[PDB]
């Protein structure tokens, strides 16, 4: 047949062509049932707070603060300077540093060796 779209990084395998939903198994359906159960609980008490007439302000969401604390607080305490971590730090934080310094300095000195030798345009450059 026309060969199947291999899932990409920015586009997963289509939900139509998922083998798991086809070759289902009793434990697979069990693992798909209790998620519905806990999700039902999670919709329930949310509805109770949401439909409470005296509900004022915000229904504080634990998951949101969990995400914010994970992406704001835990990053350094959980950080270990592995060889890969130091490598990424060297490649990103200080890597392009010498690249930009080299290119900028090369242009600066190349042009400098053009003014004091007179080999540049200065007729109407009285503003800089």
């Amino acid at each position: 047949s026309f060969p199947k779209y291999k899932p990409s990084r920015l586009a997963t395998l289509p939900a139509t062509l998922d083998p798991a939903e086809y070759d289902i198994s009793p434990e697979t359906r069990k693992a798909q049932a209790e998620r519905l159960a806990i999700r039902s609980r999670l919709k329930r008490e949310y509805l109770l707070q949401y439909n409470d007439p005296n509900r004022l302000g915000v229904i504080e969401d634990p998951a949101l603060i969990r995400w914010t604390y994970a992406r704001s607080a835990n990053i350094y305490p959980n950080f270990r300077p592995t060889p890969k971590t130091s490598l990424l730090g060297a490649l990103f934080g200080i890597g392009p540093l010498f690249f930009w310094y080299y290119v900028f300095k090369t242009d600066r000195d190349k042009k400098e060796k053009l003014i004091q030798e007179g080999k540049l345009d200065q007729t109407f450059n009285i503003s800089y």
């Binding site: 519905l36 159960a37 999700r39 039902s40 609980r41 919709k43 329930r44 109770l48 439909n51 007439p53």
Partner: peptide, 22 residues
């Protein structure tokens, strides 16, 4: 209706946690 409906959903809640999203 709030107290009546909360006790209503309480009496017919699936015992020990809601089971279905109904």
């Amino acid at each position: 209706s709030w107290e009546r409906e909360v006790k209503q959903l309480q009496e017919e809640t699936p015992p020990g946690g809601p089971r279905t999203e109904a």
